[PDB]
Amino acid sequence: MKFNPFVTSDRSKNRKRHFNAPSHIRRKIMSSPLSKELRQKYNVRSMPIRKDDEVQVVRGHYKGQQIGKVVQVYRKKYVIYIERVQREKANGTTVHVGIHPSKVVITRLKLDKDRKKILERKAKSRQVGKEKGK
Amino acid sequence: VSELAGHQTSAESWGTGRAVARIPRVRGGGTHRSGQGAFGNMCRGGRMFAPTKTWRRWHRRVNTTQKRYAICSALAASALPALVMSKGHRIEEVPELPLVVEDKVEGYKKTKEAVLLLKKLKAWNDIKKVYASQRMRAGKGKMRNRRRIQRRGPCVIYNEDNGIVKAFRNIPGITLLNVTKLNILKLAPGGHVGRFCIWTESAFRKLDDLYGTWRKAASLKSNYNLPMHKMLNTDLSRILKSPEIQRALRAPRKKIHRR
Amino acid sequence: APSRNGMILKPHFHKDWQRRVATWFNQPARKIRRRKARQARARRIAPRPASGPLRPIVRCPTVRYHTKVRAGRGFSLEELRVAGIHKKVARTIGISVDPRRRNKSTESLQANVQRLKEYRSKLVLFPRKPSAPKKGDSSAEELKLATQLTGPVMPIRN
RNA sequence: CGACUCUUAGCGGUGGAUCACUCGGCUCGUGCGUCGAUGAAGAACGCAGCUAGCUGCGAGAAUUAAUGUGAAUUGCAGGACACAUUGAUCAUCGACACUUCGAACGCACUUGCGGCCCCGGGUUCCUCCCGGGGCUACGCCUGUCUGAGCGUCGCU
RNA sequence: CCCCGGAGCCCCGCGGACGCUACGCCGCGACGAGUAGGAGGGCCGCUGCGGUGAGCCUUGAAGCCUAGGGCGCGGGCCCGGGUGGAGCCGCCGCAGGUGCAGAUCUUGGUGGUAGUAGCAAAUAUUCAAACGAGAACUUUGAAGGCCGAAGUGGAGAAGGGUU
RNA sequence: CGAAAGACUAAUCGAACCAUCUAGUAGCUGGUUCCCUCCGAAGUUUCCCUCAGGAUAGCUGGCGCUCUCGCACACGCAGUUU
RNA sequence: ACCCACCCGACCCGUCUUGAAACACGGACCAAGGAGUCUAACACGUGCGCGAGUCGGGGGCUCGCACGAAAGCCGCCGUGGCGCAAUGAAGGUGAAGGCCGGCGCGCUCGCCGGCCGAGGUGGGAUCCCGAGGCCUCUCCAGUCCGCCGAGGGCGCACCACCGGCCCGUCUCGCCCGCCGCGCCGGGGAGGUGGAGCACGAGCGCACGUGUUAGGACCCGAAAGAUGGUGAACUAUGCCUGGGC
RNA sequence: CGCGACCUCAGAUCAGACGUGGCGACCCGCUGAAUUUAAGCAUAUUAGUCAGCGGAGGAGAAGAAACUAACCAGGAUUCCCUCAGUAACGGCGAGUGAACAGGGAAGAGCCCAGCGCCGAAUCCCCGCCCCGCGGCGGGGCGCGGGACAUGUGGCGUACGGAAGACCCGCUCCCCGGCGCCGCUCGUGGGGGGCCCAAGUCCUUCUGAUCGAGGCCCAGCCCGUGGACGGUGUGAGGCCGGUAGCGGCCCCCGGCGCGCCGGGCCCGGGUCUUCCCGGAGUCGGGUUGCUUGGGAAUGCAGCCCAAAGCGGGUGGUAAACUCCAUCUAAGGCUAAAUACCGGCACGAGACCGAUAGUCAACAAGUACCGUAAGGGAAAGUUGAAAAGAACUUUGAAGAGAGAGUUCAAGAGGGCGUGAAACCGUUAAGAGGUAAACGGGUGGGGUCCGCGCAGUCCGCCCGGAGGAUUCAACCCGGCGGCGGGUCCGGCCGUGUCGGCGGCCCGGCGGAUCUUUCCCGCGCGGGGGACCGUCCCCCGACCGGCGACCGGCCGCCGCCGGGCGCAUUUCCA
Ligand SMILES: [Mg+2]
Ligand SMILES: [Mg+2]
Ligand SMILES: [Mg+2]
Ligand SMILES: [Mg+2]
Ligand SMILES: [Mg+2]
Ligand SMILES: [Mg+2]
Ligand SMILES: [Mg+2]
Ligand SMILES: [Mg+2]
Ligand SMILES: [Mg+2]
Ligand SMILES: [Mg+2]
Ligand SMILES: [Mg+2]
Ligand SMILES: [Mg+2]
Ligand SMILES: [Mg+2]
Ligand SMILES: [Mg+2]
Ligand SMILES: [Mg+2]
Ligand SMILES: [Mg+2]
Ligand SMILES: [Mg+2]
Ligand SMILES: [Mg+2]
Ligand SMILES: [Mg+2]
Ligand SMILES: [Mg+2]
Ligand SMILES: [Mg+2]
Ligand SMILES: [Mg+2]
Ligand SMILES: [Mg+2]
Ligand SMILES: [Mg+2]
Ligand SMILES: [Mg+2]
Ligand SMILES: [Mg+2]
Ligand SMILES: [Mg+2]
Ligand SMILES: [Mg+2]
Ligand SMILES: [Mg+2]
Ligand SMILES: [Mg+2]
Ligand SMILES: [Mg+2]
Ligand SMILES: [Mg+2]
Ligand SMILES: [Mg+2]
Ligand SMILES: [Mg+2]
Ligand SMILES: [Mg+2]
Ligand SMILES: [Mg+2]
Ligand SMILES: [Mg+2]
Ligand SMILES: [Mg+2]
Ligand SMILES: [Mg+2]
Ligand SMILES: [Mg+2]
Ligand SMILES: [Mg+2]
Ligand SMILES: [Mg+2]
Ligand SMILES: [Mg+2]
Ligand SMILES: [Mg+2]
Ligand SMILES: [Mg+2]
Ligand SMILES: [Mg+2]
Ligand SMILES: [Mg+2]
Ligand SMILES: [Mg+2]
Ligand SMILES: [Mg+2]
Ligand SMILES: [Mg+2]
Ligand SMILES: [Mg+2]
Ligand SMILES: [Mg+2]
Ligand SMILES: [Mg+2]
Ligand SMILES: [Mg+2]
Ligand SMILES: [Mg+2]
Ligand SMILES: [Mg+2]
DSSP states (O other): OOOOOOOOOOHHHHHHHTTTOHHHHHHHHEEBBBBBBHHHHOOOOOEOOOOOEEEEEEESSSSSSOOEEEEEEETTTEEEEEEEEEEEEETTOOOEEEOGGGGGEEEEOOOOOHHHHHHHHHHHHHHHHHHHOO | OOOTTTTTTEEEEOOOOOOSSSOEEEESSSSSSSOOSSTTTTTOOOSSSSSTTTTSOOOOOOOHHHHHHHHHHHHHHTHHHHHHHHHTTSSOOOSSSSSOOOOTTTTTTTTHHHHHHHHHHHTHHHHHHHHHOEOHHHOGGGGGGOOOEOOOEEEEEEEOOOSSSHHHSSSSOOEEEETTTTOOOHHSSSSSOOOOOEEHHHHHHHHHHOOTTSSOOOOOOSSOOOOOOOOSOOOHHHHHHHHHHHSSSOOOEEEEEOO | OSSSSSSOOOOOOOOGGGGGGGOOOHHHHHHHHHHHHHHOOOOHHHHSSSTOSSSEEEOHHHHHTOOOOOEEEBBBBBHHHHOOOHHHTTTTBOOOBBBOOOOOOHHHHHHHHHHHHHHHTTOOOOOOOSSSSSSSSHHHHHHSSSOOOOOSSOOOOO
C-alpha cells in the first residue's frame, strides 16, 4: 500500500500529472532500462534516455536484436526516434517511428561528465540500501 | 449536489396564451438558451427533484451489547470448519481449525518469513486463491479508485505488534487484527459469518480475559458476559430419535388417500 | 390537517433553517485536532501536570446537587493565607487561585487548606538554574521523576 | 409482372441514441490564512520569425537576472551552442524590471491645458524653441517657518 | 410354541424415502369480476457498495441488429448468427437521483403537408463581340428606355468601422 | 411628463425594465414510469365564512390476538320463519 | 415468430366525469431526460439487544487512518435523557389490606401483642387428581403399560362485575399529638373529580405505514417587497442651429 | 506705538509620518421588508430574516461580575451536551421561546483615572561618534530644540493599597549584539533538490500483449515495496513511483552552551498611622422599537435628574422592614469557536458530456440587450499519421483503380452508430382508410432431421471369442461399531476433604482504626461474606470428550487359489 498521506493514488490526478508534466520531469519519466551487461557494470537499473544512446527496441513490430543509435527525444510526444526504426510514407519519404523509451533497452550510454555523476550517485544509494538490508 | 445547481438562471414563465407550456423559460437573449425551460426537474439544465443534501443521516449507530454479541458470533463461527469452508476459504489441509501459532510470529520482520509460515500451516492455498481472484471491478467504480478487486484472505489476530504487521502486509488478502480491538467488519466480511483466522497463543489466551467465560465476567470490558443460549441441544435429530420423545408420539399416519 | 388522535405538535421549521444547518462531519478531525493539541501542550510543559494546575474541592449549589462535590475554579485567598502560600506565587507553582470565592463555612476551608498542604508535600520544585539554591528539591527527587501526572492532579472523589 | 401503396426482411443513407472511456465537476476533510499611494483588484493597449484565440508577459513585453536541473525546443524554419561548458530545456524565483487608465494624485478627460526646479541640443542664462529628468491630490497627526486678532496680559 | 443381519414382506414397533432446499415435499375440499384504495410475492428489471462464484473476457467484454431456436401467466430471460472492439456478469447482503405514452412536459432529431405556397409595388428591354469549361444575368460596342436637377446626379452630418 | 386619450416613459404602461427575496402561495387545471396474486369502497353523518375544501362518524384494507372443534363425544351468533 | 387469405369479433388512447368513440380537452413521429424525496417530530405495527432498568451522546483514552474520518475501550457507564408515581391552579400531599389475641365500653371509633400478606364473584387455553371401563389363547390371582375417561381440583393471560388504596374536592362527625398548646399539626365515615396504585415493562437500535413542519410528488398565477438601469422612442420645459 | 509673553486661529509643493480602494465564507455595527403561515385579515408570524449602508481580522466579537444563587452555596468569556420545545410570550390562535444549576472542550489573567508621595525623576525631534542595520535599534556624547505643571514617568487600583517600626530569610531577572554546540517526533521540525528491490526468463496466442501454460514452496525473483499512473490489451518485478528511525545535498526555523554590551540592589510575614473610586451618569417619567421577560428584558429620543454605611441586583406594581449579593458611568487580554472567499493538499457506496458547476473544449467565450443585465452550444480517427504516393474521368466538387492499417464495413465533426425518417434490392398482397383480437389454411424463412430413428438401459438364455479373479484362507494397513467402562485420560450433578482459602483472585455501604504507611480521612494489609480452584474416594448422566487393548464387521494392498469360478467384448 501507500501510506504517505500527501501522495495521491487517484487516476485523474496521476493522469493529469503525467500529460501535463514539464520537460525536466518528463526527462525522468522517459527513462529506460540498461542492458544486463551495463547493469552488472554500473550497479544501476535504469537511466533517463538521451539524444545519442545506442539502443535496442524490445517489444512491438520493431522488436529486434539490432542496436540502433537514438536520433531524437520528443518529450512532448513521450517518445524517442531510433536510427533504422522507420517506415516509408505513401510518397516514398521515410518517417521515424516513435518508440516509447520503456520498451527499449540501452546497450551503450553516451557518457558525459554529468551522466557519469548520475550513475555514480545511483550506484551509491543502491549500495547504501544493500548495506542497510544486511 | 450543489445548492445553486439549477437555480443560477433567472427564468420567468411566459404565462398561458403563447402556446408553449407554463414552464419557467430563460429570459431573453440571442442564444440557443433562450425561451428554454429552467428549474423543472424535467428540463434540460433543470434542477434534480429533491436535491441530495449533506445532512442526510449517513451514520448509523448500534447498541454496544449487540456489537459485542455480533463479534462473539463471528468468532464462534471462525471455528466450525463447515462455515469457514462455506465462506469459501480453502481450509482443506489446515491442521486444526481454531488455528493457534507460536509467538515468534510476533518476531517476524520480513514477508519471506510470513509467507513461509503460511505455507507450513497450509493456509497458502487461501492466498493462492486470492491471487487468482484479482480482477477488474465492473462498472463506474473503475473510474473512482476502486479499480481492482479480490478475495478476503486469512485473518491474523495478534496480541502485540512486535513486527508482525509489517511482515503480513504485502501478502494479498491478509488482514491483521489486534485482539484487544476486534472488528466485525473484518471477522465477518459481507456480514457473512465464517472466516478463516490464524491466532497467536498470546492472543488466543487473551480472548477469555476479553469476553469472559460463562461463569466469569469479562474482566476487561467492565460489565459483560457472553450471551446466553436460547436452546442448548442444537442438534434436533438426536432429540427427535431419543427414547424419551418417541415413546410419547402417536404413530405416523402415512398412507396417502388420493382423490 | 390532523387525523384521529396524535400529539398536537409544533415543529420549529418555519424559519430559513436549511440556511443554518450545522453538520458534524468535522467531529472526528476535531477530536484528533484536540488530542494533538493536548499532546503538544503536555510536551511543552515538560514535567508539569498535563492536567493544568491543582484545583479546589467545592460543593455544588442548589438543593439538587448539594450532596455532590466538584473541582472548583481556584483556591480562595483565605485558604492560601492559612496554607502559607503567597497569592502571587501560588500561580507559579501550579495552584489555581480565584479571588472571587467567599468562604462561609469553616468545614470547606480546612479541607481546601489540607489540599494545598498535601500538594506542597508531594510537589517537586525544580531549581531555577541546575546549580541548586534553597527551596528547590534534591537531585534524588528529580532524577527519579521529571515525570508528568496523567489525568487531573490529586483527583476529587465524592 | 406492369405504376402507386402497404407490410416484412437485406444492404445503403439520414440522424446521433446506447455502450465503453474521462487532464471536468459535485460533496466531505486537512493545513495555512497573504491585497493596496513602495499604486491593489479590475480595465485598456501592446509584445512571437511565421500567431488570430486561449494562455504568458510589459517597450528588458511568449520574458532579463540568479539558483536547481543537465540536452533539448519542435507545426516549419532557422539557428545557436563545443551539452569535458554558468550549460540547451524545464522548474524554482531571493535580484532587476513592470506601457496607459484605475482609490488614481498638477488641472482636465479632449487624450486637451498646464506651473515650478535641474540637465542635453538651443543658448553661450537670451529668453525663447525642442528633447530629457524631478516635483506639483485631498484629509489628518508630530514638529517647523511665516503670520492674524478693540482675545488675555506685561514692559515701554 | 425358537433368532428378521433374515418374517420375506400389504406391515413390520430391530433400521429406515427415489421424498426431507422442513422457508422442503405431499394430500383432500372449496372458491377466482373489479375503479378509487390497501396488502403479499416477484430465480422481474436498472445503477453503485461489502461478500462470494480458483465466474466469464482479444481463441472477442459492453452495446447494437436479427423472417434463427426456446423458456416463463407476466414483468422478463436464455441460447444461435451478425456487428463491435474492452471490459462484464451469477449468487448472498447493503444502498438509491431505480422502470414512462401522455404533463399545450424539457433538449435534440425526422416526417406528411410539398417539389406545394411562393420568388407579381415603383413602364424595358434588344442585337453583336470579348473573356471564359460554362453566359438570359459579367464586360465592351451599338440601339431602345427610365431618373428628369424637391434626381436613381454631385457632396457632407450622425451611425457604421475597413465596408 | 401630459392642449387630458389613463396618453406617453426605448415593439412593454389603469403603474417601465433588470436582478434578488423566490422553488412566493394555490380548497383550482394538467401529469405522475414494471409484473402477477388476494381483499375491495364511497358520493351518506354531524361541525365548519362550510356548499369545487376540510373534520367526524360510516363503508375498505392490513396486522393480529382470545377461544371453538371432525381427533364418535359443540357453544354462541343471524337483513329468515315459527 | 415473417407475409398473405378467409369467417367471426372488434370505435382511440390518456383524462376529469352520474355518463366519452364523442361535435369534451392533451397527443404529427422517434430518441434521451422527466414527478411521492430527504431532515425533524410524533404515533402504531414489526425485528433484534439488554431488562427495573436502559441508553449514548458529548467528551476522553488507544495512530502516521492505506483500508479509519472506521474499529475498540472508558469509577467518564452515567452529568443527563426516557423509565421506575401520581394528583393538585397552588401551598402541598403521595398509593395496604386482611386476619387473630389483648387493652380502651369492640363504640362497625381509639391504643397495644401475634399471624398472614396484594382482596373477592363469574368465565377462562391449560396443568393436576381421578371412579370406572377396554382387553390379554382358558379359571382365578396379579404387579406393569397404555387408550379413553364420568366426576372433581389448582386456575395463566384477558374480559365483565364488586370491594380496597393514593391526590383533588365536598358533606358529616368524633378523638389524638407536642420544645414551641395554636386562626398549630394529625387522623375517621360517606359521596364525588384524576391522563392514578392493585408484584414492574421499559430503554436503545433498525425497518414499515400513517400524520404533520419544511421548496416537500412535479409543473403552473394575477400579485407583494428590496435594491438598481433607462427620456437613442415618445411626453413636456429650456439652450443653440436649420427650414417653409 | 512699538517691542515682548501667552491664548485662539490661519497659510505652506515646509520636515517626517499615516488614512483613502479592494476582497468579503466566516466576524462586529447599523438599517430592515414582503411574499409566506394564520385555511380570510389588520396584532402576531415570516424576522432583527433577504435586500441596503458602514468596519475588521486570521479569526472576529466576548471577557475578568454593579454575576449566579438562596445551597452545606458557586465564581471572567467563548464552545459542546443537557436543561427544553421547558419557565414564559401569544387575536393565550397560528405559532414562538430563553436562562441557572450539572457534565465536558479550554483555561489566564491584568492595567489606568482618582487618592497620595517622589527637584518632571517622563516623552518627542535634532546633531556627532562606536556597534548593529531587507521587521530603524542600542550605547555614549552635546547649554541643541520642543512637549509637559490645564500634569509626563515610578510606586499603586478594591484580591485592598500606602507609609512606619522591629520577626524572618537571603540576593537572578531581563534585553542589543556577537559567536559555538547538539538539525530538534511520525516516528530528522518546515521548505527545496537529487537518489535508492525484484523477470522484459522460457514456450505460445496477438496488429501490438501488461494475456495463457511453465520456472528448485502457486510455479522464478523482490516484497518495511501486491497504492496509483504510464507504456501498441489485463503489469508487484518495462519506466515513474510505492515501502523504509532510508541516503546525500542545500536553505530556514525552533530550541541548548560561551563571550561581550548594557540595564537591575528588585523580598515576605507581624503590629501601628493614614488612603480609597469614573455625572447630564445612575435613577425616574416617557414615547418608539426590541425581548420568553409577563404593572416596561434590552436599546433609544425627549423631560426631569441623584447619592455616598451610597449605588445596583435579588423575574408582579408599591410602602415599611430585616438579610444576601455585587461595585456600575475608563481600558487591555491568548485558548477551546467560526469559515460555500483565498492559497495548497487529501478523500468519496456522488455525477459520467441533455448528467456533473453556466462552463471536461479558445466560457462568463460567442451572441443578445441603450443599459442594469442575460448567456449558450460544443468531448472521442488510429497503437502509430502510417492522414490515401501514383494512374485515370471530370472546369471542379466529386468519383474508379492503386495503396496505409488488424480494420477506413476507423477517411480528418472520422469509436460504437439505435429509433423516427428516407433510397433501393427480395418476397408477398392490394375497390369498403389502415391497424387489431380469436380461429384455421396457403406461402416463405431458417432450424432439427432420416439417405431406417427404429431409441436406449437392467437382468436372463444361448452360441462365439477374453483375460484374470472373486469364494476361501494367510500377511500387512486403514476404518467402523461394541460392550467388559476392563485399564487410563476426559467432563456434568452430588457428597468428603476446608483441602486451593495466606502457596485463588476480584467484589462488598460486612467488620477491625488490637494492625502498617500517609496525612477524623486516603492507601495498604488483617478478619468476614459472596464468588472463582487443588486432592482423593464414592454414586450417577458414561455425555461424539478421548486414548489403549480385546472382540466382531467392513474396506484397500500384497500373497496365494488356473478355471463347471471371473469379469471383459461383440
Ligand atoms: Mg444540472
Ligand atoms: Mg454497464
Ligand atoms: Mg481539561
Ligand atoms: Mg380478482
Ligand atoms: Mg481502445
Ligand atoms: Mg445515485
Ligand atoms: Mg417518450
Ligand atoms: Mg408554383
Ligand atoms: Mg414618369
Ligand atoms: Mg459618391
Ligand atoms: Mg447621394
Ligand atoms: Mg376612461
Ligand atoms: Mg414545486
Ligand atoms: Mg374549493
Ligand atoms: Mg374538477
Ligand atoms: Mg376515453
Ligand atoms: Mg357528439
Ligand atoms: Mg380543461
Ligand atoms: Mg392537439
Ligand atoms: Mg427515460
Ligand atoms: Mg416498537
Ligand atoms: Mg396516525
Ligand atoms: Mg412531504
Ligand atoms: Mg411560481
Ligand atoms: Mg399584500
Ligand atoms: Mg477598507
Ligand atoms: Mg393567509
Ligand atoms: Mg390559503
Ligand atoms: Mg389573501
Ligand atoms: Mg420578530
Ligand atoms: Mg444583507
Ligand atoms: Mg479580540
Ligand atoms: Mg469592566
Ligand atoms: Mg454561566
Ligand atoms: Mg425532555
Ligand atoms: Mg421570534
Ligand atoms: Mg498620576
Ligand atoms: Mg496499464
Ligand atoms: Mg502497474
Ligand atoms: Mg522500479
Ligand atoms: Mg416581536
Ligand atoms: Mg416581588
Ligand atoms: Mg475588548
Ligand atoms: Mg455534450
Ligand atoms: Mg452532447
Ligand atoms: Mg453540461
Ligand atoms: Mg452520449
Ligand atoms: Mg452532442
Ligand atoms: Mg461520435
Ligand atoms: Mg459519442
Ligand atoms: Mg472494426
Ligand atoms: Mg472502428
Ligand atoms: Mg471512442
Ligand atoms: Mg463512426
Ligand atoms: Mg427498407
Ligand atoms: Mg414488388
